[PDB]
């Protein structure tokens, strides 16, 4: 994912007419203020999976920041209906030290124009919700933005690589009864089928 932060800086303003041609400037990480927006539910082992790009500023002071990254987040998976299972894994973003009276977060909508299907999960959606949390210390609220990735599994693989062999094996197991007893092959067939199932358990 690529984050998108947009804010306004009062101190980074200038007159275009006095600086002809200079319509933008770019500042590295530690040279200007950036907000402490980061993933609460991160499991990355460095906790900030973002790549610190540069911050772009235009004459009005509007500042625009894209930290891309490979983010690992904690989400409960339910495999009860495997492989016919839909997961709702969420991503909770918020400031770490600022309240709603100092950092008024505003959630604008997510972008899927760049989505790349992977072949094991179908993306239902990724809706967002701005929420607020109050505390005993004071009336000021603490906001957050949660994006809920919803996805359903694709069964074309397990369907015809885990359930066709099992059905064929079960049918062959049922086949033993038709076999006459004179042929000393009923036990052979049944036990060999069980052995084949035991092997199938490895893939399974």
């Amino acid at each position: 994912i690529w984050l998108q932060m947009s804010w306004t800086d009062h101190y980074l303003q200038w007159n275009v007419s006095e600086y002809p041609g200079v319509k933008t400037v770019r500042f590295p990480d530690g040279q200007i203020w950036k907000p402490d927006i980061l993933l609460y539910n991160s499991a990355d082992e460095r906790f900030d999976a973002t790549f610190h790009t540069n911050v772009l500023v235009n004459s009005s002071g509007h500042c625009q920041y894209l930290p891309p990254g490979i983010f690992k987040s904690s989400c409960y998976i339910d495999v009860r209906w495997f492989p016919f299972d839909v997961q709702h894994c969420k991503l909770k973003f918020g400031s770490w030290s600022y309240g709603g009276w100092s950092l008024d977060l505003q959630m604008q909508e997510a972008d899927i124009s760049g989505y790349i299907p992977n072949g094991e999960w179908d993306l239902v959606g990724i809706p967002g919700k701005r929420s607020e949390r109050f505390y005993e210390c004071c009336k000021e609220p603490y906001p957050d933005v949660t994006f809920t990735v919803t996805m359903r599994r694709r069964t074309l693989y397990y369907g015809l690589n885990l359930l066709i062999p099992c059905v064929l094996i079960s049918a062959l197991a049922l086949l033993v009864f038709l076999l006459p007893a004179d042929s000393g092959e009923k036990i052979s067939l049944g036990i060999t089928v069980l052995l084949s199932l035991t092997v199938f358990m490895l893939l399974v």
Binding site: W2, Q4, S6, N58, Q64, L66, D111, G114
Partner: protein
């Protein structure tokens, strides 16, 4: 029929081939939709194409009906 296009830079006023009498434009937000704004694709097509969920289309049938928003 003359349709604006973006495959030529600077933006041109190319004259469309036959069989394609609909100038169209397609616009959506990419990552840089905060500073740069929405994307712009202009052209001439047989019939104006499918609109994905995140894409907007404004289809015309007249000359130079699909200019860049500045114009």
């Amino acid at each position: 029929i003359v349709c604006h296009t973006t495959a030529t830079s600077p933006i041109s006023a190319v004259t469309c081939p036959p069989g394609e009498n609909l100038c169209y434009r397609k616009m959506w937000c990419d990552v840089f939709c905060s500073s740069r704004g929405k994307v712009v694709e202009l052209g001439c097509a047989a019939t104006c194409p499918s609109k994905k969920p995140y894409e907007e289309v404004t289809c015309c049938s007249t000359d130079k009906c699909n200019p860049h928003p500045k114009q």
